[PDB]
PDB file of C-alpha atoms in Angstrom:
ATOM      1  CA  UNK A  14    -194.514  48.434  55.005  1.00 22.80           C
ATOM      2  CA  UNK A  15    -196.826  50.230  52.587  1.00 21.83           C
ATOM      3  CA  UNK A  16    -195.027  51.295  49.441  1.00 22.31           C
ATOM      4  CA  UNK A  17    -195.269  47.692  48.559  1.00 24.41           C
ATOM      5  CA  UNK A  18    -198.608  48.090  46.681  1.00 25.79           C
ATOM      6  CA  UNK A  19    -197.988  51.681  45.450  1.00 30.13           C
ATOM      7  CA  UNK A  20    -194.715  52.954  43.920  1.00 32.43           C
ATOM      8  CA  UNK A  21    -191.914  51.098  45.996  1.00 31.43           C
ATOM      9  CA  UNK A  22    -189.153  53.313  44.679  1.00 32.25           C
ATOM     10  CA  UNK A  23    -189.990  55.776  47.588  1.00 32.72           C
ATOM     11  CA  UNK A  24    -187.946  56.516  50.806  1.00 32.09           C
ATOM     12  CA  UNK A  25    -186.868  52.843  50.769  1.00 33.27           C
ATOM     13  CA  UNK A  26    -184.256  53.778  48.136  1.00 36.32           C
ATOM     14  CA  UNK A  27    -183.541  57.255  49.422  1.00 35.90           C
ATOM     15  CA  UNK A  28    -182.676  55.867  52.888  1.00 35.85           C
ATOM     16  CA  UNK A  29    -180.216  53.795  50.824  1.00 34.55           C
ATOM     17  CA  UNK A  30    -178.880  56.892  49.033  1.00 36.93           C
ATOM     18  CA  UNK A  31    -178.119  58.640  52.337  1.00 39.28           C
ATOM     19  CA  UNK A  32    -176.297  55.484  53.505  1.00 39.02           C
ATOM     20  CA  UNK A  33    -174.305  55.016  50.398  1.00 37.65           C
ATOM     21  CA  UNK A  34    -173.447  58.615  49.941  1.00 37.42           C
ATOM     22  CA  UNK A  35    -171.251  58.475  53.030  1.00 35.72           C
ATOM     23  CA  UNK A  36    -168.217  60.216  51.562  1.00 35.05           C
ATOM     24  CA  UNK A  37    -166.166  57.650  49.646  1.00 35.11           C
ATOM     25  CA  UNK A  38    -167.568  55.502  46.805  1.00 35.60           C
ATOM     26  CA  UNK A  39    -171.277  55.985  46.517  1.00 36.20           C
ATOM     27  CA  UNK A  40    -174.197  54.375  44.677  1.00 35.89           C
ATOM     28  CA  UNK A  41    -177.189  56.521  43.674  1.00 37.37           C
ATOM     29  CA  UNK A  42    -180.558  54.814  43.153  1.00 38.14           C
ATOM     30  CA  UNK A  43    -182.840  55.750  40.348  1.00 39.88           C
ATOM     31  CA  UNK A  44    -185.497  53.930  38.254  1.00 42.33           C
ATOM     32  CA  UNK A  45    -187.063  54.579  34.859  1.00 40.61           C
ATOM     33  CA  UNK A  46    -189.763  52.063  34.230  1.00 39.55           C
ATOM     34  CA  UNK A  47    -187.860  48.903  33.146  1.00 40.27           C
ATOM     35  CA  UNK A  48    -184.509  50.472  33.967  1.00 41.54           C
ATOM     36  CA  UNK A  49    -182.545  50.638  37.119  1.00 43.57           C
ATOM     37  CA  UNK A  50    -179.654  53.070  36.692  1.00 41.38           C
ATOM     38  CA  UNK A  51    -177.425  53.374  39.716  1.00 42.92           C
ATOM     39  CA  UNK A  52    -174.679  55.954  39.314  1.00 42.11           C
ATOM     40  CA  UNK A  53    -171.528  55.782  41.343  1.00 40.30           C
ATOM     41  CA  UNK A  54    -169.657  58.957  42.132  1.00 39.64           C
ATOM     42  CA  UNK A  55    -166.216  59.304  43.745  1.00 39.52           C
ATOM     43  CA  UNK A  56    -164.755  58.382  40.422  1.00 41.48           C
ATOM     44  CA  UNK A  57    -165.812  54.792  40.730  1.00 39.97           C
ATOM     45  CA  UNK A  58    -163.858  54.286  43.906  1.00 43.83           C
ATOM     46  CA  UNK A  59    -165.260  52.012  46.618  1.00 44.51           C
ATOM     47  CA  UNK A  60    -167.084  52.727  49.826  1.00 44.20           C
ATOM     48  CA  UNK A  61    -164.597  51.038  51.945  1.00 44.18           C
ATOM     49  CA  UNK A  62    -161.296  49.208  51.818  1.00 45.89           C
ATOM     50  CA  UNK A  63    -162.348  46.198  53.859  1.00 48.85           C
ATOM     51  CA  UNK A  64    -164.290  42.999  52.941  1.00 50.57           C
ATOM     52  CA  UNK A  65    -168.019  43.524  53.455  1.00 50.48           C
ATOM     53  CA  UNK A  66    -170.672  41.222  52.165  1.00 51.20           C
ATOM     54  CA  UNK A  67    -173.023  43.433  50.235  1.00 53.38           C
ATOM     55  CA  UNK A  68    -176.380  42.757  48.543  1.00 52.18           C
ATOM     56  CA  UNK A  69    -179.491  43.982  46.723  1.00 50.29           C
ATOM     57  CA  UNK A  70    -182.892  42.379  46.957  1.00 49.58           C
ATOM     58  CA  UNK A  71    -185.916  43.011  44.648  1.00 47.80           C
ATOM     59  CA  UNK A  72    -189.228  42.214  46.430  1.00 47.03           C
ATOM     60  CA  UNK A  73    -187.561  39.498  48.498  1.00 44.02           C
ATOM     61  CA  UNK A  74    -185.438  38.015  45.708  1.00 42.20           C
ATOM     62  CA  UNK A  75    -181.630  38.483  45.196  1.00 42.88           C
ATOM     63  CA  UNK A  76    -180.535  40.975  42.528  1.00 42.08           C
ATOM     64  CA  UNK A  77    -176.884  41.578  43.030  1.00 41.80           C
ATOM     65  CA  UNK A  78    -174.323  40.758  45.666  1.00 44.62           C
ATOM     66  CA  UNK A  79    -170.933  42.560  46.076  1.00 44.11           C
ATOM     67  CA  UNK A  80    -168.100  43.930  48.221  1.00 43.61           C
ATOM     68  CA  UNK A  81    -167.566  47.446  49.638  1.00 41.89           C
ATOM     69  CA  UNK A  82    -163.891  47.415  48.630  1.00 41.38           C
ATOM     70  CA  UNK A  83    -164.914  46.936  44.993  1.00 41.28           C
ATOM     71  CA  UNK A  84    -165.338  49.696  42.502  1.00 38.39           C
ATOM     72  CA  UNK A  85    -168.892  50.881  43.050  1.00 35.67           C
ATOM     73  CA  UNK A  86    -168.955  52.132  39.528  1.00 36.24           C
ATOM     74  CA  UNK A  87    -168.163  48.805  38.031  1.00 34.48           C
ATOM     75  CA  UNK A  88    -170.626  47.322  40.449  1.00 34.42           C
ATOM     76  CA  UNK A  89    -173.455  49.756  39.939  1.00 35.32           C
ATOM     77  CA  UNK A  90    -173.411  50.184  36.196  1.00 38.46           C
ATOM     78  CA  UNK A  91    -173.153  46.432  35.692  1.00 39.14           C
ATOM     79  CA  UNK A  92    -176.481  46.290  37.547  1.00 39.31           C
ATOM     80  CA  UNK A  93    -177.636  48.910  35.104  1.00 38.21           C
ATOM     81  CA  UNK A  94    -176.389  47.087  31.979  1.00 34.67           C
ATOM     82  CA  UNK A  95    -179.042  44.571  33.037  1.00 38.28           C
ATOM     83  CA  UNK A  96    -181.592  47.412  32.832  1.00 41.95           C
ATOM     84  CA  UNK A  97    -183.800  45.936  35.523  1.00 41.92           C
ATOM     85  CA  UNK A  98    -187.536  46.548  36.102  1.00 42.11           C
ATOM     86  CA  UNK A  99    -186.751  46.279  39.847  1.00 40.50           C
ATOM     87  CA  UNK A 100    -189.340  48.429  41.732  1.00 39.27           C
ATOM     88  CA  UNK A 101    -188.625  47.542  45.297  1.00 39.18           C
ATOM     89  CA  UNK A 102    -184.948  46.910  45.737  1.00 39.18           C
ATOM     90  CA  UNK A 103    -183.236  46.873  49.041  1.00 39.52           C
ATOM     91  CA  UNK A 104    -179.703  47.905  48.571  1.00 39.72           C
ATOM     92  CA  UNK A 105    -177.840  47.062  51.869  1.00 38.36           C
ATOM     93  CA  UNK A 106    -175.062  44.700  52.952  1.00 38.02           C
ATOM     94  CA  UNK A 107    -175.808  41.543  54.858  1.00 42.23           C
TER      95      UNK A 107
END
């Protein structure tokens, strides 16, 4: 909408944080220059226990795709091993 040209890591990610921090497994979004580090609380346990098709998109391109019954900690920190420069990343299932 607007953050596109500016920072990008704004409310677009925090709206994600509120959605992912829903009780069970939860992915937190944070960026440091060339480094996406998403931390998973709930001891790595998953969001859900059912098959949902998940995904992350950086500026219209696919970053990572996963399932809610997976260990959000093995999911998230894999994404972070990559240490991605991803500024505008949409973390939401499809």
